[PDB]
Amino acid sequence: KVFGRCELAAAMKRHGLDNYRGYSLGNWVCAAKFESNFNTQATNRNTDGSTDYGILQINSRWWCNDGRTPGSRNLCNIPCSALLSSDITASVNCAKKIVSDGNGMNAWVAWRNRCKGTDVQAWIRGCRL
């Protein structure tokens, strides 16, 4: 599913991501834009052989099992394919673990390089939330 911007904002808000660990909703929408272009089916292989899955590009080295990543810890206890669903529940519940792991949203490369320090409230402009 390719979400609309405000559609995704409303879903992320429903699941409690607004100001989760202090990160306002626009941070999460910005991250999803630049990680996946709002596409739940996005997958991208990393140089280390791991793959990133879904709307928030969650990585198979630590967080989900894809059966092809040596040393996978599967800390979210899910198959990576569950992160590709049109229902974002699994991605959100895993992202809450990730953002609580110590480095905050710096875990997301696209957030660090493209959202951090910018006017992230623009990402929720116009949305009825």
Task: Tell me which residues are annotated as active site.
Answer: 35, 52
Q: With contacts defined by CB under 5 A, name the span among 3-11, 13-21, 47-55, 64-72 that binds Na ion.
A: 64-72
Nearest-approach distance from CB 70 to Na ion, in angstroms: 10
Nearest-approach distance from CB 98 to Na ion, in angstroms: 12
The verdict on whether residue 66 carries a ligand-binding annotation is no
Residue from 104, 114, 116, 127 touching Cl ion (CB under 5 A): that is: 104
51, β-bridge pairs: 45
Residue 81 touches Na ion, criterion: CB under 5 A: no
Residue 57 touches Na ion, criterion: CB under 5 A: no
Q: What is the size of the binding site for Cl ion (CB under 5 A)? A: 1
